[PDB]
């Protein structure tokens, strides 16, 4: 096993170390570069959301509801529960003539510290419509209604909408059904685990489909839907997360060049459209990147992802400088004295 | 290296893993049991506070201020900034005729989520007296005043109070000064790093001194002062942390049998008075335990510390059941469904 870490120090003394796994794959999922164990069996959590959104958009009759790009971005989101996210959740429920009572996700403290502060000040108790997964849940309800299935149990593994999700995830991974494992997520849906490189493969396919669409290529409905998902996330990155969130700041900085998505417990995935940077890495098409911090630390994840983009030459120093607060998180004490820092002793292997 | 972990799962699928280091030592610091690397160079952080409190109590003239056992417990604390902790800090300042403006620590968000919620609701900005380390800082200012040193720089390495702390830490560890490294803490004081087993040694000495005092044994001034610290922490565990906090609940459950203390970034130390349990582990005196979670996760620390007490046979099932919420942390989703749990794939080696 490779020994790839992100390390924090206090005065040069090692504080914490965090094991890093990463895969960099081409449009077919061939491994180009790695850290740690690039095939680590990994719970993709929210980083699987574009695959779930594909299952929703491929459900017959869902096109009739008129979901727009911002709605699809919300299906792909771990949003901050800003008022605009709650409003768009309600808009999507109304498009399918459903009610908040039909949701089978629950409320939680906001993924944004500033939103949660406003909630605490107002004694607000979040409900189902506030879930960071609310857009995905409305999409699943939409799919269940569109094919005339029951809506009560849309979130249960035996429901046809979850059969569609399970098949679609395995297909995008190029895995047999038996090679994808399933548990239950915080939002009470089935959630997949598969080798980490296949999360990179999903995002390589998203970016590859975006390149194919832009070139005016004849596309299957699946490739057209993957291109639409890429475009929706890149055009509405504030729907995918929210103000001050890594994913939103990353996708705004890159202005269409890539899409990026967090998974709970510190997974990350990026789909990179073909560029001078991807060609310099030795591939003639789109690229996927997937990362897992073994111990689940989110601060370390954002620092590593930003360091990996710098090492891969993705963006420019000016584009990546928008992410400086995440790349090198502050280690300043209560008296304004810098006491430590973050370092990246890992080495990409080709 | 041994492969000692604490793991979380979702439906039996590995979520996060965390490397565990631990030392179990006798009263002289002989290693009895280990996990991971028992000599890992480790920043003790707040787990060093009993050693710093010894340096304060061994400063000539500090006895004249009339600090009581709850004040000494506050010197040993990472408190939750409850109103009782803030009031006692200001009472301690009054005993030494010093003011909040003399403190060289700063305010921070409360270590208690429930306290921090109350602060957010009231727009409260914490100040120096709110520091979780405020009791240690007042004790250092007390020492500086008692010997007629300057107070302005009590926190600087060249100050006699820091010279006394540095010597006292090396003496309790039985280390040469050059084998203790120093950084700067969150509270803006020097903070020591030394091999993890020597943190266990400090706490074995605390508990050994408590045994000597209780048995009416003639004691050195250092052993009497260590026994006083042990008694203060065990009698006033709400000063050491606060309501709902692991350290307070642990020390209340054990009712004088042990003291325990958190260090930031997931170190922990316990001093165990001689008992049927310590004799069964193969020592005729007190025991020390020290733990570090490599990646710094606190939830995992409290789970591992509680698991270690069970494995070592310290306490009884009834005493340890008070800590069941920490031992086996809840993994319940937003809809009340249990999605996973914590497991302890580590093996104590003798
Ligand atoms: Cl949220
Ligand atoms: Cl700090
Ligand atoms: Zn979800
Ligand atoms: Zn401190």
Author numbering:
A (entry chain DDD), B (entry chain CCC): 3 to 352
Quote from the publication.
Rhizobium etli, a nitrogen-fixing bacterial symbiont of legume plants, encodes an essential l-asparaginase (ReAV) with no sequence homology to known enzymes with this activity. High-resolution crystal structures of ReAV show indeed a structurally distinct, dimeric enzyme, with some resemblance to glutaminases and β-lactamases. The active site of ReAV, deduced from structural comparisons and confirmed by mutagenesis experiments, contains a highly specific Zn2+ binding site without a catalytic role. There are two Ser-Lys tandems, all connected through a network of H-bonds to the Zn center, and three tightly bound water molecules near Ser48, which clearly indicate the catalytic nucleophile.
The orthorhombic (OP) and monoclinic MP1/MP2 forms show similar packing pattern with solvent content of 49.4–52.6%, whereas the monoclinic form MC, with a significantly different arrangement of the dimers in the unit cell, has 53.2% solvent content. In all cases the electron density maps have excellent definition for almost the entire protein molecules, except short disordered regions at the N- and C-termini. In the close vicinity of the Ser48 hydroxyl, there is a characteristic, almost tetrahedral pattern of three closely-spaced water molecules w2, w3, w4, visible in all crystal structures, except MP2. In all structures, regardless of the hydration state of Ser48, the side chain of Ser48 is also H-bonded to the Nζ atom of Lys51 and Oγ of Ser80.
